[PDB]
Amino acid sequence: GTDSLKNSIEKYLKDKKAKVGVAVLGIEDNFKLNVNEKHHYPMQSTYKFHLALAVLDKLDKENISVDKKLFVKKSDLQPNTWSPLKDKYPNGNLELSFSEIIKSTVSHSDNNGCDILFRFVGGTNKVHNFISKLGVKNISIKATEEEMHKAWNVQYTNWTTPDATVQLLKKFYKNEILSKNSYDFLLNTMIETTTGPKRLKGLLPDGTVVAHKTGSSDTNNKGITAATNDIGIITLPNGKHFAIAVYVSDSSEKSDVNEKIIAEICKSVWDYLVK
Amino acid sequence: GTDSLKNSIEKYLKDKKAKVGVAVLGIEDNFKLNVNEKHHYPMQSTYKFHLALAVLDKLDKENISVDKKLFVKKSDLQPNTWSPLKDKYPNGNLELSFSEIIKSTVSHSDNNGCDILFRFVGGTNKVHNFISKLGVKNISIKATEEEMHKAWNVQYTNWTTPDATVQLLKKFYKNEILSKNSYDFLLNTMIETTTGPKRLKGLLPDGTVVAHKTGSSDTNNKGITAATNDIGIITLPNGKHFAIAVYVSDSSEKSDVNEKIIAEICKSVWDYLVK
Numbered sequence A, B: 001g002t003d004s005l006k007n008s009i010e011k012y013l014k015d016k017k018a019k020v021g022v023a024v025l026g027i028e029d030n031f032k033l034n035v036n037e038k039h040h041y042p043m044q045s046t047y048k049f050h051l052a053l054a055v056l057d058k059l060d061k062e063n064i065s066v067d068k069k070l071f072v073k074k075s076d077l078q079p080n081t082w083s084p085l086k087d088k089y090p091n092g093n094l095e096l097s098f099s100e101i102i103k104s105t106v107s108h109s110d111n112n113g114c115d116i117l118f119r120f121v122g123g124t125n126k127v128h129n130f131i132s133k134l135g136v137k138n139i140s141i142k143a144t145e146e147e148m149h150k151a152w153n154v155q156y157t158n159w160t161t162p163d164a165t166v167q168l169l170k171k172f173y174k175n176e177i178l179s180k181n182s183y184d185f186l187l188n189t190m191i192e193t194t195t196g197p198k199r200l201k202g203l204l205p206d207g208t209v210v211a212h213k214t215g216s217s218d219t220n221n222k223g224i225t226a227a228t229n230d231i232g233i234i235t236l237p238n239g240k241h242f243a244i245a246v247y248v249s250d251s252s253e254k255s256d257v258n259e260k261i262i263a264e265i266c267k268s269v270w271d272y273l274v275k
């Protein structure tokens, strides 16, 4: 049955000109599915989940309220990157709460908010170690968003296996990582995500709860899109949950196809688990 | 006097590690100042002005109302680029007016709106020719935003001299290019610009009217920022106007310094003209 679902996904992937990594882990039960999982996939913005974990842990441990505010300099809001915060606050030089910054960074994938938070938490190495020490191997966090935008290859240094991702998502969902309040906060923020609505969510019934974080790369001069990703936890019609991570990497396919790969793989998994 | 202002600007630029092109043209009088003007500077987002001219001309000539709507596909709203439209409409697949698209493209520098409009108007070559046929030489329009994001060098194909820019801005301000309504619309849209508030506007008195369009590049792995630009028309305290264009190119300086170069050069010009 699980083997059959796997074979269906593998057959779907046969004519897609991309390297697609898939992992699924049940939250409450023992369901497990991996496809192409031993490869290293570039995370792009999906690593803002990991960053948010480390940030909220730091706030939890050091007794810093999420309503406390950072001073966000104009130079912290750089122009040549995706940034709803910057368009909201074009002059910068203002106090913003950790709450507001994290919500933008995670739900709207702000790149400036990401790097502001890397600086707050003490750098990429802090977050890399934090994750490693949760007992999840096969995740590498090396470069900030600014660093990734400087050169095409730098994104591949921020890599993961897909099964690492869902292991981490399951530790998180069972609230094994954060305080209750920080867990509630991050989970709500992941359900509130507005990006990628035609990825994991794309072909699921209207109103399905999907707590998720997307990531995307650009396309290079050879027509390759390095990363089109979506990771999250999905609620089934009976209240149970599954963690799923899909990484469409090094793809020669157009963006509509890359998103559809995620949506169709997710639908296949959903259809199996509801049945 | 004008020669003295020039010498002041040249002296300011002596210790700045960037190639800075400057042009100023009075709108109503004969004032003219050029610095480093024979070089070719990468325009980045400043070419959305030129695009808007060609678009509004097309709408004017073909009797198409600016309130008419394009269908903006989800694939027209690409994720790895600066785009307030995309964050506003994450599902895309909706009807948006030319008005709304142009306001986002010009006032908020949306990159997706830019490329949607390049497609509407018939491509970069259409806009290149349109501009050339206004009688303004030394502007090259070759690449869309998507094309620029594929490779570092592509931005240099969209180049200008600074004096070309202010020649064009003056033709525009005197409403020699568009209908009255389209002129009014584009001018209002340029005053409504929210980007770059610490560039041309940075050191001018609060409330000074500055109709402008900014542009920025990223920084490469060698620490060079190709472009930090601002172009526009400024209203003096006595109602007269000047067109100014500043291109801080191939800069080893940090972003705060690059912006400050524009702000300080503009202030110098402002101080001269008010006196």
Ligand SMILES: *C(=O)N1C[C@H](NOS(=O)(=O)O)CC[C@H]1C(N)=O
Residues within 6 Å of the ligand: A043, A044, A045, A046, A082, A108, A109, A110, A111, A145, A195, A196, A213, A214, A215, A216, A217, A218, B079, B080, B081
């Ligand atoms: C993250 O991968 N990025 C930030 C932003 N969001 O895109 S997302 O919708 O897939 O998370 C733009 C794309 C990408 C990047 N290029 O920085």
Ligand SMILES: *C(=O)N1C[C@H](NOS(=O)(=O)O)CC[C@H]1C(N)=O
Residues within 6 Å of the ligand: A079, A080, A081, B043, B044, B045, B046, B082, B108, B109, B110, B111, B145, B195, B196, B213, B214, B215, B216, B217, B218
């Ligand atoms: C234009 O140069 N771009 C679009 C957007 N706006 O920046 S602006 O404020 O200088 O016009 C982001 C930067 C840039 C680009 N990299 O596309």
Ligand SMILES: [Cl-]
Residues within 6 Å of the ligand: A080, A081, A082, A111, B080, B081, B082
């Ligand atoms: Cl980006």
Ligand SMILES: [Cl-]
Residues within 6 Å of the ligand: A171, A172, A173, A174, A175, A176, A177, A178, A179, A183
């Ligand atoms: Cl947790």
Ligand SMILES: [Cl-]
Residues within 6 Å of the ligand: A080, A081, A082, B080, B081, B082, B111
């Ligand atoms: Cl961009």
Ligand SMILES: [Cl-]
Residues within 6 Å of the ligand: B171, B172, B173, B174, B175, B176, B177, B178, B179, B183
């Ligand atoms: Cl005009």
Ligand code: NA
Residues within 6 Å of the ligand: A013, A018, A019, A020, A021, A036
């Ligand atoms: Na594959």
Ligand code: NA
Residues within 6 Å of the ligand: A026, A027, A028, A029, A240, A241, A242
């Ligand atoms: Na389960």
Ligand code: NA
Residues within 6 Å of the ligand: A037, A038, A039, A138, A161, A162, A163, A164
């Ligand atoms: Na693995």
Ligand code: NA
Residues within 6 Å of the ligand: A074, A077, A086, A089, A090, A091, A092
């Ligand atoms: Na800002």
Ligand code: NA
Residues within 6 Å of the ligand: A069, A095, A096, A097, A100
């Ligand atoms: Na706030």
Ligand code: NA
Residues within 6 Å of the ligand: A069, A095, A096, A097
């Ligand atoms: Na605030």
Ligand code: NA
Residues within 6 Å of the ligand: A103, A104, A105, A107, A108
């Ligand atoms: Na937000």
Ligand code: NA
Residues within 6 Å of the ligand: A122, A123, A124, A125, A126, A127
């Ligand atoms: Na560190």
Ligand code: NA
Residues within 6 Å of the ligand: A123, A124, A125, A126, A128, A141, A142, A143
């Ligand atoms: Na690191």
Ligand code: NA
Residues within 6 Å of the ligand: A131, A132, A136, A137, A138, A139, A140
């Ligand atoms: Na790890």
